[PDB]
Structures are given as structure tokens and as C-alpha cells.
Design a protein around this ligand. Structure first.
Ligand SMILES: O=C(N[C@@H]1CCCNC1)c1ccccc1
Length: 150
């Protein structure tokens, strides 16, 4: 009973979370997952400021109201070579990664590791936070509040 959460650097408190190495998070699960990180889905403004501080990914993830990819460098296989906060317009499907925003994080680039899931609750799942540098933090718990996500 395991969940792997790959996380990134935080940029102005915004970071990316990929669950189990594939697009697998619903919008309801994304809100609960960010809440477990004492975080919320970023607003478009928060994500734009994170982008300006150096944040980019090559993965679709939820923010408040939209599914986006923050891009700094044009890359043909990432958001069709666009720069800026690329907004997903047309998709058949509902599961993506998520972005989260933690207000207590540093104001600019914070590429230290994530070392806790501070607001997870009691539960049976071994949840492992996996940093980009491979460092891991594991705890037993749960963060999903909607049955349809379990
Ligand atoms: O673990 C986190 N931050 C660490 C704290 C110690 C120093 N470096 C980052 C964290 C938790 C929840 C959301 C975002 C980040």
C-alpha cells in the first residue's frame, strides 16, 4: 500500500508533484494532496510569479481553475514550444500531476529538499516523498478525503 510523490524545488512557494510516476491525480485528489503539504492549488498569479523566479516543468498539472505547464525555455516536446504559463485547452482526460503553493516557503528559488508531508492524516498508506536528488521521506498516512480517489 504505497504512494510515491515526486516533488520539485519550490519557486516563490510553488512546486510540482507527480504521483506514482504517471499522470494520475484527479482535481479533487490534487486539492487534498496540496493540503497534506500545508499548501493549496496555486492561483494563476502565484504560478506566473513562480515562473518568473525560474520555475519550469514539462508536465501538465493542476493550478486553481486550469491545467498548465510553466515554461521558460522553448522545447518542442514541452507545451508545443511555448513559453510562459501554457494553459491546456483541449483534452479528453481528467488526470494530471499537480502544482501546490506553500506560503511559508522562501520567496524565490528554493532547491532544498522537501522533508515532510506535514498535514497528512492517520491512515494505512506508506507515502514516500521523492526529491529530484533521490532523497526520500516516508510516512504512514493518508491525504485523500474523497472515496472516488481511493
Ligand atoms: O519540506 C518542506 N520544506 C523543507 C523544510 C526544511 C528546509 N527545506 C524545505 C515542504 C513541506 C511542504 C511544502 C513545501 C515544502
Amino acid at each position: 500500500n504505497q504512494i510515491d510523490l515526486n516533488v520539485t524545488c519550490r519557486y516563490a512557494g510553488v512546486f510540482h508533484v507527480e504521483k506514482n510516476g504517471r499522470y494520475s491525480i484527479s482535481r479533487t485528489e490534487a486539492a487534498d494532496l496540496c493540503q497534506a503539504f500545508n499548501s493549496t492549488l496555486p492561483t494563476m498569479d502565484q504560478m506566473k510569479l513562480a515562473l518568473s523566479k525560474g520555475f519550469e516543468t514539462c508536465r501538465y498539472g493542476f493550478i486553481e481553475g486550469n491545467v498548465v505547464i510553466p515554461r521558460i525555455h522553448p522545447n518542442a516536446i514541452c507545451a508545443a514550444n511555448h513559453t510562459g504559463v501554457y494553459i491546456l485547452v483541449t483534452s479528453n482526460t481528467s488526470h494530471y500531476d499537480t502544482y501546490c503553493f506553500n506560503a511559508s516557503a522562501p520567496p524565490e528559488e528554493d532547491c532544498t529538499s522537501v522533508t515532510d508531508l506535514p498535514n497528512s492524516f492517520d491512515g494505512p498508506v506508506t507515502i514516500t516523498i521523492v526529491n529530484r536528488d533521490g532523497t526520500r521521506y516516508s510516512k504512514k498516512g493518508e491525504y485523500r478525503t474523497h472515496q472516488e480517489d481511493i
